[PDB]
Scaffold this active site. Structure first.
Site, short mmCIF file in Angstrom:
data_model
loop_
_atom_site.label_atom_id
_atom_site.label_comp_id
_atom_site.label_asym_id
_atom_site.label_seq_id
_atom_site.Cartn_x
_atom_site.Cartn_y
_atom_site.Cartn_z
N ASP A 218 0.30 -1.36 -0.03
CA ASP A 218 -0.41 0.12 -0.16
C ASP A 218 0.48 0.97 0.29
O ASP A 218 1.51 1.66 0.66
CB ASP A 218 -1.03 -0.15 1.34
CG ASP A 218 -1.95 1.00 1.58
OD1 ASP A 218 -1.90 1.41 -0.04
OD2 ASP A 218 -2.21 1.53 2.53
N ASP B 114 -2.48 5.62 -5.26
CA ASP B 114 -2.77 4.41 -3.76
C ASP B 114 -3.30 2.87 -3.91
O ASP B 114 -4.54 2.85 -4.48
CB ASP B 114 -4.03 4.92 -2.93
CG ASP B 114 -3.89 4.57 -1.30
OD1 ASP B 114 -4.02 3.45 -0.78
OD2 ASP B 114 -4.39 5.11 -0.71
#
Ligand code: 0LU
Ligand code: 0LU
Ligand code: NAG
EC number: 3.4.23.15
Length: 334
Positions: free
Chosen positions: A38, A220
């Site tokens: 992430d 993201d």
């Protein structure tokens, strides 16, 4: 002697176009965990064996089975859009696609059933910067950079669309030319510390209806969708003819392929998503409701208010995160 000619890759699993996860090994001998890589966060965490609701469905790290473990125990709390985890700090050797790193990570002891029961992964490997790390803990990529083994101080992402096909892939130290067409187009980060770029506009077909005076875009890898502020999404969904349900936005399945193109103006170009890139076209019936891979997320300051370009965007555009140059590159995924 470390020579900088290494380019390691982690194979990812695609769970329903929303969760892309790979394997990491923690300890001696290695204990394997399914993790999401992430860019929106900077901490590494896995569930702990010391976990007393979601813990029941995941693999737990047992420090007592690792010879390389070093105790710390500082309390730590990690807030995500979706949910909050809590635990303590531990240090051990982490193996990620061949690369071995001595890493401080979180041993999670508080993992709520909602939303963590819905996670198909065990933990998270935060690929963001130290500026955003909780407890000022050195991120895994910063530690890999310090080893001086990588060909280049970059990492790239390939997210496939859900036979015996590859769900995705992360390349540490480079990009895989088998997963992209043409050349990369780079956009510099506004500032170091966050994988965020300036966006010059969002267009629905013909007309540029949002982000007219510019906005921000967080790239993201941990986000499943493309998100904007509640305000921006309400306007976008109205332009699409979509209707609000409880957790999602829907359109009549038959109307799905008729939906206009969504364009994101980033750096020099327009990055277009057709209806096929953002509609979960599970049916073509006029009597059924089809979900959109777009939602609202109000990202709080210092990072937000911002758009987030998640898996929905990344499936279309193979992404390269350049730490040396503080820039992001996009190329059409293949
Ligand atoms: O998987 C779906 C999303 C999933 C989920 C996961 C983590 C946190 C919140 C929610 S909301 C919710 C509610 C009920 C059932 C499942 C879910 C998304 N869908 C769109 C495409 C795949 C299915
Ligand atoms: O984007 C997804 C968020 C995803 C996730 C990814 C990186 C770091 C933490 C978490 S929390 C969590 C917990 C359970 C399942 C999935 C997830 C959730 N989304 C599904 C629909 C939109 C929200
Ligand atoms: C835990 O690690 C941090 C470094 O990240 C250090 O400053 C702190 O003193 C350590 N705490 C203990 C109890 O070892």
């Amino acid at each position: 002697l470390t020579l900088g000619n290494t380019t390691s890759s982690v194979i990812l699993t695609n769970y329903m176009d929303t969760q892309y996860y790979g394997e990491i090994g923690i300890g001696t001998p290695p204990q394997t965990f399914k993790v999401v890589f992430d860019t929106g966060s900077s901490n590494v965490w896995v569930p702990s064996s010391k976990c007393s609701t979601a813990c029941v469905y995941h693999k737990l790290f047992d420090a007592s089975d690792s010879s390389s473990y070093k105790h710390n125990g500082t309390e730590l709390t990690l807030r995500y859009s979706t949910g909050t985890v809590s635990g303590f700090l531990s240090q051990d050797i982490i193996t990620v696609g061949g690369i071995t790193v001595t890493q401080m990570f979180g041993e999670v002891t508080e993992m709520p059933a909602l939303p963590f029961m819905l996670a198909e992964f065990d933990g998270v490997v935060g690929m963001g910067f130290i500026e955003q790390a909780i407890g000022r803990v050195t991120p895994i990529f910063d530690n890999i950079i310090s080893q001086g083994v990588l060909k280049e101080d970059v990492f790239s992402f390939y997210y496939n669309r859900d036979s015996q096909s590859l769900g995705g892939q992360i390349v540490l130290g480079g990009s895989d030319p088998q997963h992209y067409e043409g050349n990369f187009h780079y956009i510099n980060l506004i500032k170091t510390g966050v994988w965020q770029i300036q966006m010059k506009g969002v267009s629905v077909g013909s007309s540029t209806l949002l982000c007219e005076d510019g906005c921000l875009a967080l790239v993201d890898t941990g986000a499943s969708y493309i998100s904007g502020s509640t305000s921006s999404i309400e306007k976008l969904m109205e332009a699409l003819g979509a209707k609000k349900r409880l957790f999602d936005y829907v359109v009549k399945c038959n109307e799905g392929p008729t939906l206009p193109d969504i364009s994101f103006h980033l750096g020099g170009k327009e990055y277009t998503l057709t209806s096929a890139d953002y509609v979960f076209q599970e049916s073509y019936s006029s009597k059924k409701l089809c979900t959109l891979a777009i939602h609202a997320m109000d990202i709080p300051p210092p990072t937000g208010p911002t758009w987030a370009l998640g898996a929905t965007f990344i499936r279309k555009f193979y992404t390269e995160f350049d730490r040396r140059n503080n820039r992001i590159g996009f190329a059409l995924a293949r």
